[PDB]
């Protein structure tokens, strides 16, 4: 009951919120169920509880990125009551949702075109999925299908659109999709949709960078964490499947002693597999502690990555020419992780981390400054200096000094400005 409640609250409420807000919401809910002694499985992961491996692989083959945020959102689109409203700065989500619904001939349209009604009821008749973009200029005759009103008369479901009456065909789903992250929907439309947010933020990008580091630098930590995720659902399903194979083989053989060798090999393999699972279970929390330690070791680098990238996007404020995309930073990051001459023969993990951090700063500055005005080079250098200062340990934050340096020089202290010594001038004084 507890884990089911947590998962339902996540898939029904925790939409439109970035990863940190969803995680805080889940933590608050789990803390309350701990206060209520409601037995929910500890440290549960919603990515694979609501979905076994098969559809994860299908989504990956359906042009979906491997982010935890995108995985949870694919969960939300998979299991929904109110028709989703996809929010995505990029086109990854729309491509994924079309590739997922190719067999059932999903169609493309938008609110702006004059043919939206026509293919709307055309998809309503044959049960065709319908994706529609540009939700900003919302269309009111979409209301009675969002409310899912059903006028079932005479042993058959009906629906009303305008002055028309239409037969509501089963297996019909509509996916609303938008392009602009910063839009304010009205509450009437907000209530009828399950918001799915694909906007990348500091939290999401931090998660991607940390996962990529764990995959690249320490594949053993990555495999251990992956085994932890599969431990809850995937290993048990494999175990049940191969048990069913054992039962089928026993039935076909009928328990002959002559075939006892082939069956005993299977049962010994079974016992070994079970011993492996139990060993993972008995060593679970050690693995959790080790993964936590490694994640804390590599935590500042991911924060630096997110800060650098969001600094790159903020660079458009200085000049219209400093437009940078997430793909640019991802390419920078891939080049730093893999194509690094400085990691040709380095083996110490802490040394590798330090070299990656330093080379990431160097390469990011070098690529950005190559297409940036010379008068602006020192500004971005100072920005990266601030990022390292926030990321470095053993140093004070220097918040007051930097605040003065930045904006504290515009404060009202003109009173009592003594001329002092002849060297000091009025503005100097």
């Amino acid at each position: 009951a507890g884990d089911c409640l947590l998962s339902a609250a996540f898939i029904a409420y925790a939409g439109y919120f970035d990863q940190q807000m969803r995680q805080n919401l889940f933590t608050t809910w789990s803390h309350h169920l701990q206060q209520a002694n409601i037995q929910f499985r500890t440290d549960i992961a919603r990515t694979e509880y609501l979905s076994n491996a098969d559809e994860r692989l299908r989504w990956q083959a359906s042009s979906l990125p491997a982010d935890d945020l995108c995985t949870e959102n694919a969960i939300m689109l998979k299991r929904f009551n109110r028709y989703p409203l996809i929010i995505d700065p990029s086109g990854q989500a729309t491509e994924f949702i079309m590739n997922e619904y190719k067999d059932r001939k999903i169609t493309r349209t938008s609110f702006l075109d004059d043919a939206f009604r026509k293919n709307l009821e055309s998809a309503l008749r044959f049960g065709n999925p319908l994706l529609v973009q540009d939700v900003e200029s919302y269309d009111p005759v979409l209301n009675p299908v969002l409310n899912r009103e059903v006028r079932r008369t005479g042993g058959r479901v009906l629906i009303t659109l305008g002055d028309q009456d239409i037969d509501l065909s089963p297996s019909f789903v509509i996916f609303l999709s938008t392009r602009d992250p910063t839009v304010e929907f009205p509450p009437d439309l907000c209530s009828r949709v399950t918001f799915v947010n694909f906007t990348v933020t500091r939290s999401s990008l931090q998660s991607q960078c940390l996962n990529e580091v764990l995959k690249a630098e320490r594949p053993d930590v990555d495999e251990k964490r992956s085994d932890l995720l599969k431990l809850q659902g995937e290993f048990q399903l494999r175990l049940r499947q191969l048990e069913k194979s054992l039962l089928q083989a026993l039935n076909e053989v009928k328990g002959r002693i002559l075939d006892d060798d082939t069956i005993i090999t299977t049962l010994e393999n079974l016992k070994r597999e079970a011993a492996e699972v139990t060993r993972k279970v008995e060593e679970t929390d050690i693995v959790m502690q080790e993964v936590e330690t490694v994640s804390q070791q590599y935590l500042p680098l991911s924060t630096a990555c997110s800060s650098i990238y969001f600094t790159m996007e903020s660079l458009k404020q200085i000049h219209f020419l400093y437009q940078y995309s997430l793909q640019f930073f991802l390419d920078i990051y891939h080049n730093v992780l893999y194509e690094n001459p400085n990691l040709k023969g380095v083996t110490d993990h802490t040394q590798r981390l330090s070299i990656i951090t330093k080379d990431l700063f160097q390469v990011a500055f070098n690529r950005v400054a190559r297409g940036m005005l010379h008068q602006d080079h020192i500004t971005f250098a100072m920005l990266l200096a601030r990022i390292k200062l926030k990321g470095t340990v053993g140093e004070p934050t220097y918040d007051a000094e930097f605040q003065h340096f930045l904006r504290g020089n515009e404060i009202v202290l003109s009173a009592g400005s003594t001329p002092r010594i002849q060297g000091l001038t009025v503005e100097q004084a």
Partner: protein, 286 residues
């Protein structure tokens, strides 16, 4: 809002005067005339006509002193509230006969709650209004014994018995649970659970539907259940529901046409109409 100043070239010809809300003496005279006309149905309460008006005028007065448009935009008061008050009491007294003053003030307080108390937002204002109703009733009528104002339920419904009588809260809860049962069976398969304030608002909607009044305005968050309760109460009282399905290329002449359709279907044919529409149906000020 939506009002534009007149051109000085045209204002020069036209004189204008400010007709403010009628003063306490004028309201007292007008609604005392209405009361004296009203209570001639039951001669047993003719002598309690002037004080009845005085109490309504006073209640209106301190309802206008507070609850300004600064507090809430919907916090507006006009003699329209008083005429609806008089009309509601008359509609309730229409079947009632040989009614003592007990019922007179009981329906007076019920209408006071249904006009100056359900439009409120916070609990403190609601309890202030209830306290003022009790205090005014005691002030103008202190010979009446205290069995009418301390009645906390103070709810009416024509559904039980045959005419408009005070009813018991649980005796009405069971009845409306049975009716809502039969309801969800006929249309709206989605189950509806009956809690306290939903019972309150279904009673208020029924009360507003029964009278020869024109409109019900429902204020609240989306998805809370205004439309479903309006449809359900219209189902009880046999009011047909006409919903307008607007769209992007919807135009004003369509609103004119379905408006005149509603008027003909309500006036030419005696069947009653509960015409329901929302903000999404409104696009322009026309």
């Amino acid at each position: 809002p939506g009002r534009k100043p007149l051109s000085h070239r045209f204002l020069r010809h036209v004189p204008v005067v400010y007709v403010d809300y009628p003063g306490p003496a004028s309201l007292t005279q007008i609604y005392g005339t209405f009361n004296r006309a009203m209570l001639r149905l039951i001669p047993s309460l003719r002598t309690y006509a002037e004080p009845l008006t005085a109490a309504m005028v006073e209640f209106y007065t301190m309802s206008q002193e507070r609850f300004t448009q600064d507090t809430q935009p919907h916090y507006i008061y006009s003699p329209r509230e008083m005429t609806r008050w008089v009309r509601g009491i008359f509609e309730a007294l229409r079947p009632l006969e040989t009614l003592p003053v007990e019922g007179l003030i009981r329906i007076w307080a019920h209408e006071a709650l249904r006009l100056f108390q359900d439009r409120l937002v916070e609990d403190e204002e609601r309890r202030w209004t209830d306290e003022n109703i009790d205090t005014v009733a005691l002030k103008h009528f202190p010979n009446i014994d205290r069995e009418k104002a301390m009645s906390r339920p103070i709810l009416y419904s024509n559904w039980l018995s045959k005419d408009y009588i005070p009813v018991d809260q649980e005796e009405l809860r069971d009845y409306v649970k049975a009716r809502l049962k039969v309801f969800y069976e006929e249309e709206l398969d989605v189950p509806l659970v009956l809690f306290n304030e939903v019972l309150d608002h279904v009673l208020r909607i029924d009360r507003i539907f029964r009278q020869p009044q024109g409109h019900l305005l429902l204020i609240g968050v989306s998805g809370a259940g205004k439309t479903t309760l309006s449809r359900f109460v219209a189902w009880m009282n046999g009011l047909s529901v006409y919903q307008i399905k607007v769209h992007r290329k919807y135009t004003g002449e369509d609103f004119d046409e379905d408006l005149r359709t509603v008027l003909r279907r309500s006036g030419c044919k005696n069947e009653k109409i509960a015409f329901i529409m929302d903000e999404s149906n409104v696009l322009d000020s026309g």
